[PDB]
Design a binder for these strands. Structure first.
Ligand code: K
Ligand code: K
Ligand code: K
Ligand code: K
Ligand code: MG
Ligand code: MG
Ligand code: MG
Ligand code: MG
Ligand code: MG
Ligand code: MG
Ligand code: MG
Ligand code: MG
Ligand code: MG
Ligand code: MG
Ligand code: MG
Ligand code: MG
Ligand code: MG
Ligand code: MG
Ligand code: MG
Ligand code: MG
Ligand code: MG
Ligand code: MG
Ligand code: MG
Ligand code: MG
Ligand code: MG
Ligand code: MG
Ligand code: MG
Ligand code: MG
Ligand code: MG
Ligand code: MG
Ligand code: MG
Ligand code: MG
Ligand code: MG
Ligand code: MG
Ligand code: ZN
Ligand code: ZN
Lengths: 99, 129, 150, 150, 91, 25, 98, 83
RNA sequence: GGACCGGCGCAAGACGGACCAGAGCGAAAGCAUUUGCCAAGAAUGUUUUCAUUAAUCAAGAACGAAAGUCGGAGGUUCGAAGACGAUCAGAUACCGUCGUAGUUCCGACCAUAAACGAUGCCGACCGGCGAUGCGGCGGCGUUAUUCCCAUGACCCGCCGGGCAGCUUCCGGGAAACCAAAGUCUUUGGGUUCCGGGGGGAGUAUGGUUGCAAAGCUGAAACUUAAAGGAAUUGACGGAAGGG
RNA sequence: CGUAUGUUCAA
């Protein structure tokens, strides 16, 4: 039984897409199939951001952010709860979960 | 490529008929197409049609009366003898009460009943009912 | 669609219904046919000759002005090419591809395109031989074809 | 006895009206009637002789002097060459890569022939016959055949 | 008519030496004895005189080349590289 | 048994069978 | 561009113009003042190339150095033999004299 | 729309449809009367010209080929010809 | 005997991140730093040219991931094999420390992949909608091109060729689903390959190709009443979510 | 981190 119309990946009008290595297990996964997650977050967590403020030498020093792009294989994405199973019709929904 | 203009025309009429359209554009046009359409007109299965001259193969616009059940072509154009005509009727027509088999005979393009009357066999073109 | 490509393009010329010559054309049939002779003698292919006439002289269709197709006009005057232009241009392309392969023998794509080009040459030459346009024994000799074209 | 060709090169003598004939290791590509130039101000061409100091980094050379003025000791066998890696203008030294893979520091006044030694690929051919080996060493020295010590 | 199926030029070695050694030497055996097109005069009369020496019987030009071919891939690569480096020393 | 390994099993079996005939010819 | 133009223009001369293919004939035509252009293959002997250039300078005509050897200059002329030098006496329908 | 009149479509409808797909095919191109600012004579130029049209005698560029309709030179007035 | 870590510098070989998309190109395989050169190509545009020259294809031919093979160069990284350390009842594994072949370049082989859209190609018809990439055409306005001009960036449309998407009681289908997998008992546009219960078996054997590994062609005896597809309800799960 | 298995037929 076919489960997904796009076969679980974003490859439509090409033959081969270069693989990439999973962030957790380093498994080879096609770039179009990898569950991607561009993580932007402050270098200092919200708990410690206050301490760094009065520890700083600058009057108004904005905390730099951390930009990490994660690529996940299907097993690691499911295991790490990045994605979950969905129902027959819930699978077809493509909009990202609300902020 | 297009191997049979008549097949393309009859299929195009059949699809528009099923879709409830009132007019269908037929391209390209041929004497065999026009003679076939005339046979359907004389029996009321289609309305008036206007061949359109483009200094090319031609285009036709047929008025559909919502009466055709199916206008299908037979490929290849098998030779049909008078004795074998009955076995063709039992295979191509829903009943003998209605429906016609269009034959191209030496006498001219005609339906199967006119061919039987004129005692001429020929090559089968198509059918409609 | 294309015989040697997956393309199904429709781009082409749509010839107008009216075949008559317009009133604004002052060029007579003979005058147009003499202008054809200058261009062909200048070394232009029938295809090209039609463009110069259409672009700068208002001659939409030489056939409409003169009653004869350009190549047919050139045949009467004896200016017709020895090799048909379409066949000539396919041979010219094959020579250029074959020149590239001698110095780029890792170009497996150029090897693939060449087989296609030579396939069209043979299909074209088979047609010309049938209508008796090429001698009954004209063969494309990839080795000796470079001298024919350019 | 040598797998590399030699070139008879004739130079004018600077001090006497007389021609001087020099026997060179033939850099691959040189031909009879070609002019070859030797000096500090010679141009970077195959067969020219230049000090390694004036050569740019990555130059491929052959018949390279091991010491300044020794008239050529390095990379002389057929198909071998040396590479100029780097220079030290302060110490007048140049680093080269020898055919063995060893890197050697030599004076920048060491001369060399630009290019590789002709006759390369000689060892690619299987000798096949003991007789061909016999003729090979008959021109070199009495070192063949070899009896096993055991 | 075709006289040999595959051995070709190394059919002179008979059944001796081993198929692999005969196959390996075949390519060298062909290119060593081939006549190449002289670049100086255009005639196909450049043939090997000695190992690494090539001579044209028409323009009487002698060229230092490869052991078994007129020029080796190493030589043509070096000549291109030397030509570039010459431009770098210049403008 | 996995089909890929059933194929590998038979390939090894064939190689043995060819050695058994090359030894008898 | 230039290489495409020169072969196409040279092909026009071979069917409509007056020309001589060869070295001796070229010197004959230059001497008579009949040569309009002289074309030299790139592998022309250096002495021959220099001599023809001197001959053309005295004759006050033009020399074009072809971008091919005598093999490809011959193929450009449509001939199955090598042509090292040639002279054009009458351009014919082409415009190589530009 | 089941009952669409195919014999007599609107001129707007035909003008939109592809030239080959019109009821009777017609070109979208045309010829034009081009007048360069210099001289006085008029040149007939195809709309989708492929060659650089030169005003002979005047020796000026009138249009440049493009992927579609030729681009008229600046200062050149053109008027569509009628047939 | 100074590991790791920090700084400077050097060498080698591999790789081309992010931008990178259900985007493009290619017959597929496949293709991603800059610049140059070489030849090629689809689409679009065309009142150019030829005039049926076409479609599909037994034989035949070119290309064909990865692994593998042969000769040469190179060998960072990873890493079959192997060694070892763990884990375990065992552990010839999963985990870890090394590490050969290989991985890399050049040249010759090999011809297979879930080589997949598990869906031949060429042609026609059959609903709608928002996009998108390429080409062309049209049109308020914004911006740069200093002003004009055209040209680019944006906006609103149309046409053509393409990768797709959403919706639909077009119609089909065993259903999953499919705008094709529709226009099929109301059965015929053209044409190629190919299946006929599950096994035995892609095995044997003969031929052929290959350096080899193998590729291609390809049976029979015998055995068997199911094997299988799609979907339903339950049960189960070292699946998730909420109690 | 780390474990495997469950004789034949029978509703
Ligand atoms: K360090
Ligand atoms: K579109
Ligand atoms: K279930
Ligand atoms: K029982
Ligand atoms: Mg499943
Ligand atoms: Mg599905
Ligand atoms: Mg995915
Ligand atoms: Mg085309
Ligand atoms: Mg085809
Ligand atoms: Mg086109
Ligand atoms: Mg001895
Ligand atoms: Mg020994
Ligand atoms: Mg011994
Ligand atoms: Mg990058
Ligand atoms: Mg076949
Ligand atoms: Mg191949
Ligand atoms: Mg491979
Ligand atoms: Mg490999
Ligand atoms: Mg190797
Ligand atoms: Mg162990
Ligand atoms: Mg390791
Ligand atoms: Mg297969
Ligand atoms: Mg694949
Ligand atoms: Mg398949
Ligand atoms: Mg095909
Ligand atoms: Mg595109
Ligand atoms: Mg059927
Ligand atoms: Mg069966
Ligand atoms: Mg077999
Ligand atoms: Mg199955
Ligand atoms: Mg047990
Ligand atoms: Mg028990
Ligand atoms: Mg049990
Ligand atoms: Mg019971
Ligand atoms: Zn993973
Ligand atoms: Zn020579």
């Amino acid at each position: 039984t076919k489960k997904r119309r796009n076969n679980g990946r974003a490859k439509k009008g090409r033959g081969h897409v270069q693989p990439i290595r999973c962030t957790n297990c380093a498994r080879c996964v096609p770039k179009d199939k990898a569950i991607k997650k561009f993580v932007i977050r402050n270098i200092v967590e919200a708990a410690a951001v206050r301490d760094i403020s009065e520890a700083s030498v600058f009057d108004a020093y904005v905390l730099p952010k951390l930009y990490v792009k994660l690529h996940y294989c299907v097993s690691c994405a499911i295991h790490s709860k990045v994605v979950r199973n969905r129902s027959r019709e819930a699978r077809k929904d493509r909009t990202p979960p609300p902020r | 490529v297009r191997m049979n203009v008549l097949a393309d025309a009859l299929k195009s009429i059949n699809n528009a008929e099923k879709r409830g359209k009132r007019q269908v554009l037929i391209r390209p046009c041929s004497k065999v197409i026009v003679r076939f359409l005339t046979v359907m007109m004389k029996h009321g299965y289609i309305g008036e049609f206007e061949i359109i001259d483009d200094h090319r193969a031609g285009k036709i616009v047929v008025n559909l009366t919502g009466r055709l059940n199916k206008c299908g072509v037979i490929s290849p154009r098998f030779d049909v003898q008078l004795k074998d005509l009955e076995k063709w009727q039992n295979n191509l027509l829903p009943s003998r009460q209605f429906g016609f088999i269009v034959l191209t005979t030496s006498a001219g393009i005609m339906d199967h009943e006119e061919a039987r009357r004129k005692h001429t066999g020929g090559k089968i073109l198509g059918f409609f009912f | 669609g294309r015989m040697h490509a997956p393309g199904k393009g429709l781009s082409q010329s749509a010839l107008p219904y009216r075949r008559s010559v317009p009133t604004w054309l002052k060029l007579t049939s003979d005058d147009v046919k003499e202008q054809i002779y200058k261009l062909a003698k200048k070394g232009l292919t029938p295809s090209q000759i039609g463009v110069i006439l259409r672009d700068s002289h208002g001659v939409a269709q030489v056939r409409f002005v003169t009653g004869n197709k350009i190549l047919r006009i050139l045949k009467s005057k004896g200016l017709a090419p020895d090799l048909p232009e379409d066949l000539y241009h396919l041979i010219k392309k094959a020579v250029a591809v074959r020149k590239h392969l001698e110095r780029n023998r890792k170009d497996k794509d150029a090897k693939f395109r060449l087989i296609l080009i030579e396939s069209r040459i043979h299909r074209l030459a088979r047609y010309y031989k049938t209508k008796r346009v090429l001698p009954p024994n004209w063969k494309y000799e990839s080795s000796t074809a470079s001298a024919l074209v350019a | 006895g040598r797998g590399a060709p030699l070139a008879k090169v004739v130079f004018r003598d600077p001090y006497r009206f007389k021609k001087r004939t020099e026997l060179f290791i033939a850099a691959e590509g040189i031909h009879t009637g070609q002019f070859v130039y030797c000096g500090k101000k010679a141009q970077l061409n195959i067969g020219n002789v230049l000090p390694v100091g004036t050569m740019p980094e990555g130059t491929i050379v052959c018949c390279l002097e091991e010491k300044p003025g020794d008239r050529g000791k390095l990379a002389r066998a057929s198909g071998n060459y040396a590479t100029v890696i780097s220079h030290n203008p302060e110490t007048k030294k140049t680093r080269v890569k020898l055919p063995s893979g060893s890197k050697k520091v030599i004076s920048s006044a060491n001369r060399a022939v630009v290019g590789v030694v002709a006759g390369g690929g000689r060892i690619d051919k299987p000798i096949l016959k003991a007789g061909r080996a016999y003729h090979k060493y008959k021109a070199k020295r009495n070192c063949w055949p070899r009896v096993r010590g055991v | 008519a075709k006289r040999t199926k595959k051995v070709g030029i190394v059919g002179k070695y008979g059944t001796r030496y081993g198929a692999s050694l005969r196959k390996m030497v075949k390519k060298i055996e062909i290119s060593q004895h081939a006549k190449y097109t002289c670049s100086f005069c255009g005639k196909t009369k450049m043939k090997r005189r000695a190992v690494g020496i090539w001579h044209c019987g028409s323009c009487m030009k002698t060229v230092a080349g490869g052991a078994w071919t007129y020029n080796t891939t190493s030589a043509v690569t070096v000549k291109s590289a030397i030509r570039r480096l010459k431009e770098l020393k210049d403008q | 048994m996995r089909a890929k390994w059933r194929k590998k099993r038979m390939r090894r079996l064939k190689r043995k069978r060819r050695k058994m005939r090359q030894r008898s010819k | 561009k230039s290489l495409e133009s020169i072969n196409s223009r040279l092909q026009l001369v071979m069917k409509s113009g007056k020309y001589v293919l060869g070295y001796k004939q070229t010197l004959k035509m230059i001497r008579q003042g009949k040569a309009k252009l002289v074309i030299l293959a790139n592998n022309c002997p250096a002495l021959r190339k220099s001599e023809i250039e001197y001959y053309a300078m005295l004759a006050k005509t033009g020399v074009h150095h072809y971008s091919g050897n005598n093999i490809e200059l011959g193929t450009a002329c449509g001939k199955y033999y090598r042509v090292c030098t040639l002279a054009i006496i009458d351009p014919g329908d082409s415009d190589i004299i530009r | 729309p089941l009952a669409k009149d195919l014999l007599h479509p609107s001129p707007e409808e035909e003008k939109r449809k592809h030239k080959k797909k019109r009821l009777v095919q017609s070109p979208n191109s045309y010829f034009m009367d081009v007048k360069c600012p210099g001289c006085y004579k008029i040149t007939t130029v195809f709309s989708h010209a492929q060659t650089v049209v030169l005003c002979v005698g005047c020796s000026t560029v009138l249009c440049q080929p493009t992927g579609g309709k030729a681009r008229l030179t600046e200062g050149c007035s053109f008027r569509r010809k009628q047939h």
